[PDB]
């Protein structure tokens with residue numbers, strides 16, 4: 001790497017450890033969990049991860065926090081297997097934690113059907129020799145539902161607003177730190193492309209909603225830090241123009257899809273091409289058959305909802 005030999009300014013922070021005075025990245029940058037120091041004896045976690053990373057995240061958590069009885073909150077953006085998979089495994093080690101999530105997210109953990117999908121996907125990600133810890137029941141998690149527009153006063157230095165951001169999933173929320181101009185955006189802007197510096201759209205429920213969410217997030221004060229559900233912490237113009245860029249990349253995808261369909265292409269064609277182009281990034285946390293499946297689903301949603309070309 002070049003970066004061995006020069007102290008340049010990094011636009012993306014992608015290593016575990018301290019990101020800012022109040023903020024650490026725990027576990028794996030691929031599916032990170034963030035730690036906020038709220039106080040001398042108080043902490044919050046943000047993003048709920050994949051189950052197989054339990055011990056990775058737990059060891060990093062213990063590097064910074066001598067007493068895990070001091071972790072008081074755990075904010076969750078949405079119900080997908082990769083954003084809540086640690087909860088049953090680490091909540092039992094966090095006796096004072098309250099999970100904060102949307103009503104629709106909380107409802108999913110009460111659904112036998114939903115919880116078993118979450119379990120099925122997370123089991124496929126266990127590494128060689130890994131055994132998960134003892135789990136809590138999903139319906140026994142210490143949860144509180146949070147609402148659109150709600151101010152979460154996590155502590156005297158940390159007040160974060162819950163902003164509804166449906167479209168990626170029907171339950172997706174994001175969390176905005178007004179003081180720090182720092183947005184925890186989950187998968188609402190898509191998947192950040194590490195080779196190209198652009199957003200790949202992740203529209204798995206509703207395109208109109210996904211665009212409207214981005215429209216709304218573009219109106220926040222200019223971001224200084226943008227923290228998606230995968231890949232680390234973005235700063236500079238990548239943060240400041242994140243929501244706008246995410247929006248345009250989604251339009252672009254619609255244009256490609258509707259153009260190729262014009263030429264009589266099947267949806268499966270663009271899907272295999274998107275799986276080929278984009279699937280490599282998430283191979284270590286999303287089974288490849290399921291990335292292609294998700295690509296096809298997104299293209300179905302766009303095909304139905306995109307404004308026609310004539």
Ligand SMILES: [Fe+3]
Nearest residue numbers: 078080168187
């Ligand atoms: Fe997701």
Ligand SMILES: [Fe+3]
Nearest residue numbers: 082187229230
């Ligand atoms: Fe995700």
